[PDB]
Amino acid sequence: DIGSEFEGQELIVRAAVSELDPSNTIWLDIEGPPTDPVELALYQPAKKQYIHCFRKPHDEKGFKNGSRHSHGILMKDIEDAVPGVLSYVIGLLPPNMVITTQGSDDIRKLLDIHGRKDLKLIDVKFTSDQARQFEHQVWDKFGHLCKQHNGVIISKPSPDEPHCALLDCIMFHSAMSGELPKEEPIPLLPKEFLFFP
Ligand SMILES: [Mg+2]
Ligand SMILES: [Zn+2]
Description:
By secondary structure, this protein is an alpha/beta fold. It has 8 helices and 6 strands. The chain has one domain: Nucleotidyltransferase, domain 5, CATH 3.30.420. Magnesium ion binds next to strand 1 and helix 8.
C-alpha cells in the first residue's frame, strides 16, 4: 500500500471516478471481448466529461479477431498500456450506479467478471443503423479524441469505420438525444498516464 510506482495512476483514477455524478446518465462501452477488454470509455454528457483507458490483451491470438474486424487497434498502439487501469476504474464505480449501454450482454459479463453485480445496466437496444446514425459526424468533430484505431477494418464498397469505445459512447448519446453534444467532452484521465514511458 506504501511505495507503489503506480501511486499517481491510482490517484488520477480515484479523482476521475469521484467526478461521476450517479444522478446523471453515464454511458459505458468497451472494445475487445468482455474476458479480454482492450479499451474502456465512460461518458457523462451532462458534465461534458469522460473516462477513457486502454489495456494490452492477455490473449494476443484472440485479439487479432477484434483488431481486424471490429476496433482496428494494432498491438503496437496498446502493447505499452499500463496494466490494471481498466480494472481499477471498474472497481471504483459507485455502488449500485445505473449505467447506460448499447448491447448489454458483453458489458454485463465484463462487470460480473469484476465482481460488480451491483451495477445496473440500461440497454437502449438500438439497431445498428440507429446506433451509428451519427458515426461520420462524430469522427469528423471528435475523432481527435482517440488516435488509437490505426488498423484497416476487414470484412471477414468502402471499409467500415473502426469502433472506438469513446466515440461509440458519444455517438450513442447523440442518437438518443437527436444531436451531437454542444461541444467537446473533456478527458478526466490524462493520456500520458495510460501508457509506459
Ligand atoms: Mg463499441
Ligand atoms: Zn478509441
